[PDB]
Design an enzyme around this catalytic site. Structure first.
Site, PDB file in Angstrom:
ATOM      1  N   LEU A 186      45.025  33.891  44.467  1.00 56.75           N
ATOM      2  CA  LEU A 186      46.139  34.693  43.615  1.00 56.75           C
ATOM      3  C   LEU A 186      47.119  33.823  42.891  1.00 56.75           C
ATOM      4  CD1 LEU A 186      45.948  38.423  44.051  1.00 56.75           C
ATOM      5  CD2 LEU A 186      44.506  37.457  42.515  1.00 56.75           C
ATOM      6  N   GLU A 207      52.274  44.668  40.672  1.00 58.79           N
ATOM      7  CA  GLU A 207      50.797  44.811  39.685  1.00 58.79           C
ATOM      8  C   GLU A 207      49.822  44.638  41.014  1.00 58.79           C
ATOM      9  OE1 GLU A 207      47.833  42.777  38.761  1.00 58.79           O
ATOM     10  OE2 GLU A 207      48.102  43.941  37.773  1.00 58.79           O
TER      11      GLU A 207
HETATM   12  N1  LIG Z   1      43.794  37.907  39.219  1.00 60.52           N
HETATM   13  C1  LIG Z   1      43.206  38.363  39.123  1.00 60.52           C
HETATM   14  O1  LIG Z   1      42.682  39.863  38.824  1.00 60.52           O
HETATM   15  C2  LIG Z   1      41.827  38.215  40.505  1.00 60.52           C
HETATM   16  C3  LIG Z   1      40.805  37.191  40.698  1.00 60.52           C
HETATM   17  N2  LIG Z   1      40.524  36.570  41.462  1.00 60.52           N
HETATM   18  C4  LIG Z   1      40.514  35.027  41.408  1.00 60.52           C
HETATM   19  O2  LIG Z   1      38.660  34.516  41.289  1.00 60.52           O
HETATM   20  C5  LIG Z   1      38.275  33.299  42.080  1.00 60.52           C
HETATM   21  C6  LIG Z   1      37.417  33.268  42.989  1.00 60.52           C
HETATM   22  O3  LIG Z   1      36.731  33.060  42.083  1.00 60.52           O
HETATM   23  P1  LIG Z   1      35.352  32.960  41.612  1.00 60.52           P
HETATM   24  O4  LIG Z   1      35.989  31.587  43.055  1.00 60.52           O
HETATM   25  O5  LIG Z   1      34.696  32.367  40.205  1.00 60.52           O
HETATM   26  O6  LIG Z   1      34.014  33.369  42.964  1.00 60.52           O
HETATM   27  P2  LIG Z   1      33.955  35.191  42.619  1.00 60.52           P
HETATM   28  O7  LIG Z   1      34.854  35.789  42.897  1.00 60.52           O
HETATM   29  O8  LIG Z   1      33.697  35.268  41.560  1.00 60.52           O
HETATM   30  O9  LIG Z   1      32.085  35.249  43.949  1.00 60.52           O
HETATM   31  C7  LIG Z   1      31.489  34.006  43.447  1.00 60.52           C
HETATM   32  C8  LIG Z   1      29.811  34.430  44.162  1.00 60.52           C
HETATM   33  O10 LIG Z   1      30.150  35.721  43.902  1.00 60.52           O
HETATM   34  C9  LIG Z   1      28.179  35.335  44.348  1.00 60.52           C
HETATM   35  N3  LIG Z   1      27.547  35.488  42.843  1.00 60.52           N
HETATM   36  C10 LIG Z   1      28.057  35.573  41.449  1.00 60.52           C
HETATM   37  N4  LIG Z   1      27.364  35.652  40.680  1.00 60.52           N
HETATM   38  C11 LIG Z   1      26.368  36.524  41.459  1.00 60.52           C
HETATM   39  C12 LIG Z   1      24.770  37.482  41.437  1.00 60.52           C
HETATM   40  N5  LIG Z   1      24.860  37.513  39.722  1.00 60.52           N
HETATM   41  N6  LIG Z   1      24.435  38.292  42.047  1.00 60.52           N
HETATM   42  C13 LIG Z   1      24.739  38.081  43.215  1.00 60.52           C
HETATM   43  N7  LIG Z   1      25.623  37.268  43.378  1.00 60.52           N
HETATM   44  C14 LIG Z   1      26.740  36.528  42.426  1.00 60.52           C
HETATM   45  C15 LIG Z   1      27.705  34.007  44.381  1.00 60.52           C
HETATM   46  O11 LIG Z   1      27.926  34.275  46.190  1.00 60.52           O
HETATM   47  P3  LIG Z   1      26.859  33.297  47.466  1.00 60.52           P
HETATM   48  O12 LIG Z   1      27.423  31.873  46.890  1.00 60.52           O
HETATM   49  O13 LIG Z   1      27.594  33.503  48.010  1.00 60.52           O
HETATM   50  O14 LIG Z   1      25.932  33.399  46.935  1.00 60.52           O
HETATM   51  C16 LIG Z   1      29.039  32.534  44.108  1.00 60.52           C
HETATM   52  O15 LIG Z   1      29.031  32.110  44.901  1.00 60.52           O
HETATM   53  C17 LIG Z   1      39.753  33.333  43.065  1.00 60.52           C
HETATM   54  O16 LIG Z   1      40.799  31.891  43.305  1.00 60.52           O
HETATM   55  C18 LIG Z   1      40.560  34.394  43.076  1.00 60.52           C
HETATM   56  O17 LIG Z   1      41.511  34.460  43.714  1.00 60.52           O
HETATM   57  C19 LIG Z   1      39.433  37.229  42.001  1.00 60.52           C
HETATM   58  C20 LIG Z   1      39.847  38.628  41.694  1.00 60.52           C
HETATM   59  C21 LIG Z   1      40.703  38.811  40.816  1.00 60.52           C
HETATM   60  C1  LIG Z   2      39.992  42.664  45.338  1.00 56.34           C
HETATM   61  C2  LIG Z   2      40.360  40.781  44.560  1.00 56.34           C
HETATM   62  C3  LIG Z   2      42.207  40.531  44.494  1.00 56.34           C
HETATM   63  C4  LIG Z   2      42.552  41.706  43.330  1.00 56.34           C
HETATM   64  C5  LIG Z   2      42.811  42.095  41.829  1.00 56.34           C
HETATM   65  C6  LIG Z   2      43.253  42.195  41.068  1.00 56.34           C
HETATM   66  C7  LIG Z   2      44.224  42.455  40.809  1.00 56.34           C
HETATM   67  C8  LIG Z   2      45.699  41.867  41.794  1.00 56.34           C
HETATM   68  N1  LIG Z   2      45.287  42.965  40.172  1.00 56.34           N
HETATM   69  C9  LIG Z   2      44.884  43.232  38.657  1.00 56.34           C
HETATM   70  N2  LIG Z   2      44.969  43.460  37.495  1.00 56.34           N
HETATM   71  N3  LIG Z   2      43.169  43.165  39.072  1.00 56.34           N
HETATM   72  C10 LIG Z   2      42.638  42.639  39.980  1.00 56.34           C
HETATM   73  N4  LIG Z   2      41.274  42.787  40.055  1.00 56.34           N
HETATM   74  C11 LIG Z   2      43.024  41.612  45.798  1.00 56.34           C
HETATM   75  C12 LIG Z   2      43.857  40.053  46.816  1.00 56.34           C
HETATM   76  C13 LIG Z   2      44.427  40.656  47.696  1.00 56.34           C
HETATM   77  O1  LIG Z   2      43.865  39.770  48.355  1.00 56.34           O
HETATM   78  C14 LIG Z   2      45.207  38.262  48.219  1.00 56.34           C
HETATM   79  C15 LIG Z   2      44.220  41.709  48.358  1.00 56.34           C
HETATM   80  O2  LIG Z   2      45.083  42.203  49.074  1.00 56.34           O
HETATM   81  C16 LIG Z   2      46.461  42.232  48.895  1.00 56.34           C
HETATM   82  C17 LIG Z   2      44.206  43.327  47.313  1.00 56.34           C
HETATM   83  O3  LIG Z   2      43.935  44.447  47.411  1.00 56.34           O
HETATM   84  C18 LIG Z   2      44.816  44.646  46.087  1.00 56.34           C
HETATM   85  C19 LIG Z   2      42.768  41.978  46.283  1.00 56.34           C
END
Ligand SMILES: NC(=O)C1=CN([C@@H]2O[C@H](COP(=O)(O)OP(=O)(O)OC[C@H]3O[C@@H](n4cnc5c(N)ncnc54)[C@H](OP(=O)(O)O)[C@@H]3O)[C@@H](O)[C@H]2O)C=CC1
Ligand SMILES: CC[C@@H](C#Cc1c(C)nc(N)nc1N)c1cc(OC)c(OC)c(OC)c1
Length: 225
Positions: A23, A30
């Site tokens: 993040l 949040e």
């Molecule tokens: N701001 C927010 O609310 C959030 C932000 N994020 C951010 O997103 C970023 C990570 O995203 P990203 O890098 O795109 O990676 P993802 O978390 O989307 O995971 C990508 C991996 O998931 C697996 N995958 C993707 N599609 C499929 C499918 N259809 N079926 C089975 N497996 C699948 C593959 O794994 P494999 O390579 O092993 O096959 C792929 O390499 C981080 O920076 C994180 O901080 C994450 C959650 C929340």
């Molecule tokens: C599981 C992915 C991400 C997220 C999200 C996420 C957030 C923050 N907010 C919203 N509105 N949507 C999301 N999908 C997340 C990363 C973490 O490590 C840094 C966490 O531990 C502390 C975490 O526990 C809480 C959750």
């Protein structure tokens, strides 16, 4: 028949969500929202599911995973089948779509899942636009003196606004009943876009909890036998 809900925190205007595997901000309030929304249920005998890409799983600190009190599903193309228990609180799936079909079987799930939350991956979110019934999007904005953080992963805003409309008027009613928020519903202009939802400020950021819902769809065809 279980609602599928994308939940994400995104920085306006580009809707950046990540940088270098993490993040781009650390906002306790949040996190709290996300924790509470995904954990809490209206029906005390149900749990929610959280689904996440492998890379997002790997980003969670070892102490904090699997996320407590929710069924965790991790998807990876190298995993073995469409939904398989590998540990307490942890399911592995090799397919986002098939794992969603598996979770929806009321035979498998006993109608004891209330909601399915898709909690990210940029790559996961890209594939969920057609899957999700709603999006809970925290729209984040740097305050005037705040440096915009660097970002390398983004929510697909075009595809969101094609399929979904801003239903934030119904955010409060949508959320599990026992959550209390600090804001009232507010509409604010920000760099030429309408931002509506429940306001919070923390550190250098202002953010809004919002809800997006599928647009009405025409009736073109219904399968008959
Ligand atoms: N701001 C927010 O609310 C959030 C932000 N994020 C951010 O997103 C970023 C990570 O995203 P990203 O890098 O795109 O990676 P993802 O978390 O989307 O995971 C990508 C991996 O998931 C697996 N995958 C993707 N599609 C499929 C499918 N259809 N079926 C089975 N497996 C699948 C593959 O794994 P494999 O390579 O092993 O096959 C792929 O390499 C981080 O920076 C994180 O901080 C994450 C959650 C929340
Ligand atoms: C599981 C992915 C991400 C997220 C999200 C996420 C957030 C923050 N907010 C919203 N509105 N949507 C999301 N999908 C997340 C990363 C973490 O490590 C840094 C966490 O531990 C502390 C975490 O526990 C809480 C959750």
């Amino acid at each position: 028949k279980v609602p599928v809900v994308g939940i994400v925190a995104a920085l306006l205007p580009e809707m950046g969500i990540g940088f270098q595997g993490n993040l781009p901000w650390r906002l306790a309030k949040e996190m709290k929202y996300f924790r509470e929304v995904t954990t809490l249920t209206n029906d005390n005998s149900k749990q929610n599911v959280v689904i996440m890409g492998r890379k997002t799983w790997e980003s969670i600190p070892q102490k904090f995973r699997p996320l407590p009190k929710r069924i965790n599903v991790v998807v990876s193309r190298s995993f073995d089948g469409e939904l398989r228990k590998v540990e307490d609180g942890i399911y592995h799936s090799n397919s986002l779509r098939n794992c969603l079909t598996a979770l929806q079987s009321s035979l498998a799930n006993e109608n004891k899942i209330e909601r399915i939350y898709i909690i990210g991956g940029g790559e996961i979110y890209r594939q969920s636009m057609d899957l999700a019934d709603h999006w809970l999007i925290t729209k984040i904005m740097p305050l005037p003196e705040t440096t915009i953080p660097q970002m390398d992963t983004f929510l697909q805003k075009q595809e969101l606004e094609q399929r979904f409309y801003d239903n934030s008027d119904k955010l409060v009613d949508f959320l599990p009943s026992s959550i209390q928020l600090e804001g009232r519903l507010t509409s604010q202009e920000w760099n030429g876009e309408l931002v509506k939802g429940l306001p919070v400020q923390e550190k250098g950021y202002q953010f809004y909890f919002t809800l997006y819902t599928k647009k009405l769809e025409h009736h073109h065809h219904h399968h008959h036998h």
